């Protein structure tokens, strides 16, 4: 478990060979391996690399479907 500044977490965009992590609440997860986010693009509104707390309020989704992926670690 570590801990992320939003700076190193925008480091992992999914882009070049990068992991995909989101960040939730205050968790960080590898959604590296989801077809929703290789390249690191969700559904053309969202990039990976951020916290997309505020986000999900306009998915057709809920939080819930981060549960399947691991926790990397927590942001700053
Ligand atoms: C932005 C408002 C937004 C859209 C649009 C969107 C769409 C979307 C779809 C159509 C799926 C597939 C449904 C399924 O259960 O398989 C999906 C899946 C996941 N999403 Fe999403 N999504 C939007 C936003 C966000 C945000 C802001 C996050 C995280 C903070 C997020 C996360 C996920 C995750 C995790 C999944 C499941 C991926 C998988 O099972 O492989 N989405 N989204």
Same mark, same amino acid.
């Given at each position: 478990?570590?801990?992320?500044? %939003?700076?190193? !977490? &925008?480091? /992992?965009?999914?882009?070049?060979?990068?992991?995909? /992590?989101?960040? /939730?609440? @205050? %968790?960080? /997860?590898?959604?590296? @391996? &989801?077809?929703?986010?290789?390249?690191? %693009?969700h559904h053309?509104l969202h990039?990976?690399?951020?916290?997309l707390?505020e986000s999900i309020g306009r998915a057709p989704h809920t939080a819930?479907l !981060?549960? %399947?992926?691991?926790?990397? @670690?927590? !942001?700053?």
């Open positions: 478990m570590r801990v992320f500044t %939003k700076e190193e !977490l &925008s480091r /992992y965009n999914g882009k070049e060979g990068a992991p995909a /992590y989101v960040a /939730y609440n @205050g %968790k960080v /997860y590898d959604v590296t @391996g &989801s077809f929703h986010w290789k390249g690191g %693009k053309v990039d990976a690399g951020q916290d707390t819930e !981060l549960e %399947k992926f691991p926790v990397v @670690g927590v !942001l700053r």
